[PDB]
């Protein structure tokens, strides 16, 4: 069954499933917490 | 298989298995071509006119190599009750 639901009502799971596994990706968590804005002394710039 | 006007494509028009009805490729290192010359009255050979068999690779590898050729000798007119149709 390859560890996942498939049936055509289960999308409720799946877009909540990947929603909790994007945080294991690195630049996703780097991006969507404003860590480039709370740190990185350019402050998201390109020069200073 | 054929172009805008016909003209069949891709030389080495291959030959086929007669046991699993699969194909025999020019790679293959198990496929055997069998020339069964006939018999007749006086019962010798008639060498040259052949019941040509071909045996591919999966049958010869995975017990079922032998009984699959009993059927072909039966159902062509070569042997009698060596292959139980009522198996």
């Amino acid at each position: 069954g390859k560890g996942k639901p498939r049936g055509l009502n289960s999308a409720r799971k799946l877009r909540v499933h990947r929603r909790n596994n994007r945080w294991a990706e690195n630049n996703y968590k780097k991006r969507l917490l404003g860590t480039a804005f709370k740190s990185s002394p350019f402050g998201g710039s390109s020069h200073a | 298989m054929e172009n805008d006007k016909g003209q069949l494509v891709e030389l080495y028009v291959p030959r086929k298995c007669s046991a699993t009805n699969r194909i025999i490729k020019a790679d293959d290192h198990a496929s055997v071509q069998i020339n069964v010359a006939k018999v007749d009255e006086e019962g010798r050979a008639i060498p040259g006119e052949y019941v040509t068999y071909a045996l591919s690779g999966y049958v010869r590898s995975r017990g079922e190599s032998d009984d699959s050729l009993n059927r072909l000798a039966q159902n062509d007119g070569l042997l009698k009750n060596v292959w139980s149709y009522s198996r």
């Binding site: - | 293959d28 069998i34 069964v36 018999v39 009255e41 590898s61 009984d67 009993n70 000798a73 060596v82």
Partner: protein
């Protein structure tokens, strides 16, 4: 197919039943019931020997078709038929092989013991272990003999007999060789004996 020249006859069944090949092998990996009929009441299998005769009927169709008698090869690592192949050879025209099968015989086209066969008849396809394994590279048919524990792998002509007693092997060797020489053509029938004995192809005790 089966001509009026030859089919099942009870005068060559003199020979096979005189060898007692109702003594087959005693336990059967299950690929080996087109040719058994029953077993004696302690469980040793009885052979449909008329179909074992049809085996040699098509086995000679295989042999006599080739316009090259040099292309006939017979292997015998089991000691019993090691005479028999020579007993075949100068009779038939097959090049004889007996003893140890040299590892990489059908491999290594450079070395001395490299044969170019078009047809190979084996004798004991367990004792001819790397003659079963390493022969199906250059696309060769495997004329074999098959007791009830003998390989259904890599074979196509499973001739049922025993290999316990020197008479069975040379017996079926002689029963094929007689009509191979008669497919090449000397004599006719089956109740008719050949000029030389079925005793001829058998094993001495030196």
């Amino acid at each position: 197919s089966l001509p009026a020249t030859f089919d099942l006859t009870p005068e060559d069944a003199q020979l096979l039943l005189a060898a007692n090949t109702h003594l087959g092998a005693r336990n059967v990996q299950v690929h080996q019931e087109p040719y058994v009929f029953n077993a004696r009441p302690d469980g040793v299998h009885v052979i449909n020997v008329g179909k074992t005769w049809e085996k040699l009927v098509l086995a000679a169709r295989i042999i006599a078709a080739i316009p090259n008698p040099e292309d006939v090869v017979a292997i015998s690592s089991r000691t019993f038929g090691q005479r028999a192949v020579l007993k075949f050879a100068a009779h038939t025209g097959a090049t004889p092989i007996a003893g140890r099968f040299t590892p990489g015989s059908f491999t290594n086209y450079i070395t001395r013991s490299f044969k170019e066969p078009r047809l190979v008849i084996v004798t004991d396809p367990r004792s001819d272990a790397q003659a079963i394994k390493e022969a199906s590279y250059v696309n060769i048919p495997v004329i074999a003999l098959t007791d009830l524990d003998s390989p259904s792998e890599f074979v196509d002509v499973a001739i049922p007999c025993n290999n316990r007693g020197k008479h069975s092997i040379g017996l079926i060797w002689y029963l094929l060789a007689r009509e191979v020489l008669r497919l090449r053509g000397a004599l006719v029938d089956r109740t008719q004996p050949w000029s030389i004995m079925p005793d001829l192809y058998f094993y001495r005790f030196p």
